[PDB]
Amino acid sequence: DPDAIKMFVGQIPRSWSEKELKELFEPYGAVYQINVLRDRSQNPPQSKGCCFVTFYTRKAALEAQNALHNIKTLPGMHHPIQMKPADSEKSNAVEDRKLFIGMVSKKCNENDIRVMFSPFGQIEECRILRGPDGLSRGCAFVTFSTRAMAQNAIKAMHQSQTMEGCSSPIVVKFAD
RNA sequence: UUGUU
């Protein structure tokens, strides 16, 4: 129950409650919890035609999705069930690991940055913001695998040095 | 021109 994946499901009839939904999902594995997305803006509160299903096992979720997503169609819907891991399940977010690197020497490239930031973690992707058909814009984006990696790269290398052609010491901060 | 494709 530590690797479970909450699944967003869509296009289910608005008349269906947790009962019918549970009856739908249980053939694919045991269900820990299930909740219809409700609208309480006005009376009576109504279903949003979607729900969250939380299986006990990861296997149950992956399989249920594999056999339901774009396959199954509920009475009486015009479109197949849509099913995907829920937004609340995003333990890892690139936006919280991506590091903006300003005041980079215009001469530098991808690898030149890569070697500079290698000791603090493992790079997912390394890029040089540049152009449009000009040269480098003196700055780069760098994604680290963990987040603590980036939080190390910052403390260790923010304004650690001034590079070639640059007016101010290098900046290392989380991307906006 | 400190530049966040």
If asked whether residues A95 and A139 sit together in one domain, one would say yes
Structurally, chain A folds into a number of domains equal to 2
If asked whether residues A81 and A110 sit together in one domain, one would say no
Technique used by the depositors: X-ray
Tokens 């001469």: give the residue: A107
Resolution value (Å, 1 decimal): 2.8
Lookup: nucleotide whose C1' is closest to A171 CA:
B2
Q: Which domain holds residue A107?
A: 91-176
Lookup: nucleotide whose C1' is closest to A165 CA:
B1
Instruction: List CB contacts of A116: < 8 A, sequence separation 6 or more.
Output: A157
Residues A129-166: b if buried by 16+ CB within 10 A, e if exposed: eeeeeeebebbbebbbeeeebbbbbeeebeeeeebeeb
If asked whether residues A72 and A3 sit together in one domain, one would say yes
Tokens of A1: 């129950």
If asked whether residues A57 and A119 sit together in one domain, one would say no
If asked whether residues A70 and A138 sit together in one domain, one would say no
CA distance A66 to A69: 6
Residues with CB under 7 A from strand B: A 100, 102-104, 127, 129, 131-132, 137-139, 141, 166-169, 171, 173, 175-176
